[PDB]
Amino acid sequence: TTALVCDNGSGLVKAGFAGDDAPRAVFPSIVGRPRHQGVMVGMGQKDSYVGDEAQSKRGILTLKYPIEHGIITNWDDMEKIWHHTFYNELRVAPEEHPTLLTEAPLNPKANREKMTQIMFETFNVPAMYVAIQAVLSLYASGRTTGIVLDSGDGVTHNVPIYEGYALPHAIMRLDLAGRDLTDYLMKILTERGYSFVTTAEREIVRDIKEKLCYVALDFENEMATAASSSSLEKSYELPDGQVITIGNEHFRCPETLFQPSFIGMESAGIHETTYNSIMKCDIDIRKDLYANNVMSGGTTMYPGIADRMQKEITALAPSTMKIKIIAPPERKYSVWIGGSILASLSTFQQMWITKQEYDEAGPSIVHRKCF
Amino acid sequence: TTALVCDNGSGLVKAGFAGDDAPRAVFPSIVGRPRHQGVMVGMGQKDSYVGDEAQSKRGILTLKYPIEHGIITNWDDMEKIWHHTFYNELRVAPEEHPTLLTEAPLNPKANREKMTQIMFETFNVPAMYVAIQAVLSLYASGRTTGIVLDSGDGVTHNVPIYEGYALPHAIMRLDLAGRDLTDYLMKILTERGYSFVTTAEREIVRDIKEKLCYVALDFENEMATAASSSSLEKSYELPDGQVITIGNEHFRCPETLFQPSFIGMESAGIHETTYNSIMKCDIDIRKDLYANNVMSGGTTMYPGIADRMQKEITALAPSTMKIKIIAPPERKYSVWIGGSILASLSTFQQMWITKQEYDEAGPSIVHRKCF
């Protein structure tokens, strides 16, 4: 019938039919398993909870993300997640609807090939496709030239595209993302008195980072203000009812993006990588790349990240050039929106990987279409 | 005159002057108070017994450890313990000798600042320092590169250091330690029947764990042998005079270190945490970290713990990598020996926190020197 887009993120699986303006179902990419004794008999106790149900009762589960840094690690867990999606969230039979996926750039050929094989064999999708997330974000933004900073939960890549001709040599990929920021927030929330160690406590810290964390315009001045006993002190309520107070930890966690040395990473910040990727293109291109910076990913949802990166790039870039950062309110679902736009295009309807084209070259024909 | 090192452990306080090869005074970190009546007059029953005197007459006391999990909880009790140490054990006025302490990694700015304030105000130490226990253990080991496993009584941390440059992002801290092992032995001694519920009986269980408990090379085979009615059955004599017989409980209590799921902890065993910490360092560092494993503490004094840890790591580590574990006979006082070595160094004599430097920044200058 109609194609369905299933963007498999590193923590939030977004799935829905093409042509829609928003994903139909969004649930955490979490597979939880029971950890304690199954004392009560007759409760319909399943052996593995997947998705929103896993997070609903995370106090007795060992949540494990199949994706780490935009990479599939547990293939059985991803088979479980895909089956749960197709048969409980969209409530469709995948044997009819072609499926479009998203994959981060500079990802293994083995991972993408195995994903294609498992979807063409375990399920019976008549067609499938794998597209780079930044390309879909650019599609959603509505333009055709720009540099996309898709800072997802597991990966932070940067694909520069000019006039629809993406440059596959200035693509810079960083492993700093929401998961690493959550781990750093767990590490530094220790310093106040909060020892979050278990996976459920990791989810609690992720919620704290989603709710309170923000990026300061100037880091050193903000540290001085916070340490001068100012009002920069928010309060959060844990599920057990006890109120915690956060001082300077709520703007130090997202500063790791602009200073990866906080967690012992040699690579430079996202602003420096974006500037380097822009400068790695042709000289005549940056007239549009500087003025068409595009953001995506719900991590890029920190308050004040756009202004901070604009200031940093303007400091790095020549002073006589306009730097504009585009931060649409739908940054969280920009990749899925672009995928839905692309799968509904009349021209794209021929670029599918049909089952006939798959049953002849094995799970290696996917390299026919790489962005 | 001469600096003195007072390592404040989670159950054994070790204090002594710098330059010595062994702690001068070692007493339990216990503050006991009378629980029963006072019908006898003139016997001099004090209101609070601290140290070895508290454990001498624990039958009518309610022992309470001021430090739990390497974190000070009762500051009045900690002040009492410090005063008792300085004025009864070392028998020296603290107004002259600089004092060096030990603190676990990922431990409070709050409690460490409070400890600095209480020693700079209640006592008049002209200088003070706070150092990570694993760093002191590495100092005592005589080497400069390696990964330290300081499994104390309240905490079990793991600080990897290469060429004197500790990596403060692969430091893994675990809350499994001697207190939790003693509690688990208390809980599982109920199986054969002997169950100890009071604090004095908890000390008895701790003595049982110190004397009889050991770590098996393979847990499943040892459990099968013990259940097959073999000779693995030791006997212990309680203070009253009754003899208890221990079956498979004595090698099941310290198995919690390699299987924290016994007491419902999500975290992996100490071997897995050590392997993860090694893997979290740089790729070129692991060659030396694998071959320079250092153990310290006393829960590492379990017979056969070194062989078990080496076997587990060699199973986890690549087969072509030499795994060597250093288990010096002085593991119990390794931290104190390292502290005594460090406080006597000529270069370290400037890194003190002088009183003049303290009176200007308040109880917050301690973050001048963090390991």
């Binding site: 909060y194 160690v197 | 999990h69 974190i71």
Partner: peptide, 7 residues
């Protein structure tokens, strides 16, 4: 501790 664990 204050949040998480006792200490």
């Amino acid at each position: 501790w204050x949040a998480x664990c006792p200490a």
